[PDB]
């Protein structure tokens, strides 16, 4: 017989994009869950404790790449 190590693992946190862009959201709705600030907060977008982007106003979610470093920003178009 024998024994083997490294048999441990961790539970997934279900990260990723939730609204996927182009959807109609409400105030306080969570858009993306992530560890690091891969997507930065834009217009009417707040940053959570764990870098979660929540919309502060109902409207449309838009993905764009702005900034000097070509960073992705989430924008809330209040149409």
């Amino acid at each position: 017989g024998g024994s083997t190590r490294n048999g441990r693992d961790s539970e997934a946190k279900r990260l990723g994009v939730k609204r996927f862009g182009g959807e109609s959201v409400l105030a306080g709705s969570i858009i993306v869950r992530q560890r690091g600030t891969k997507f930065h907060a834009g217009a009417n977008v707040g940053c959570g404790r764990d870098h979660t982007l929540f919309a502060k106003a109902d409207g449309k979610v838009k993905f764009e790449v702005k900034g000097p470093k070509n960073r992705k920003f989430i924008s809330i178009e209040a149409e």
Binding site: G1, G2, S3, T4, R5
Partner: protein
């Protein structure tokens, strides 16, 4: 036998050797032996072929071994059950794709090169073929 001096990890997945070759032309010497089939060459086979070609040419030139064994192949010990972790590392192989150049040389004449590669190819499972460098 040649193998990497150190690696980040000891064990690797089996993987699949599908696709085409990357280095398909001789860029160092003038004559080359290149694999035409598909398989996995081992360090022992590479060393045997290198020794055969070296003793055939009497080291009257240069030899280039394009491929390098870097994939650790592990086998479980005999008479043991399934599971209980992954088997210990056994040897090292190099994934081979069709059209990839295996050995390169120069200086020696065409007859000597073809008579040396002819006996150096029998030490490898994968069928090989002889080519000469061209202008692009």
């Amino acid at each position: 036998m040649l193998q990497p001096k150190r690696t980040k990890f000891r064990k690797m997945h089996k993987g699949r050797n599908r696709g085409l070759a990357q280095g398909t032309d001789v860029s160092f010497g003038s004559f080359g032996l290149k694999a035409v089939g598909r398989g996995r060459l081992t360090a022992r086979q590479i060393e045997a072929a290198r020794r055969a070609m070296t003793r055939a040419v009497k080291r009257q030139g240069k030899i280039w071994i394009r491929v390098f064994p870097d994939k650790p192949i592990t086998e479980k010990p005999l008479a043991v059950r399934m599971g209980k972790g992954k088997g210990n590392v056994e040897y090292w192989v190099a994934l081979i794709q069709p059209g990839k150049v295996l050995y390169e040389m120069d200086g020696v004449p065409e007859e000597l090169a073809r008579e040396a590669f002819k006996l150096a190819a029998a030490k490898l499972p994968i069928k090989t073929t002889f080519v000469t460098k061209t202008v692009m």
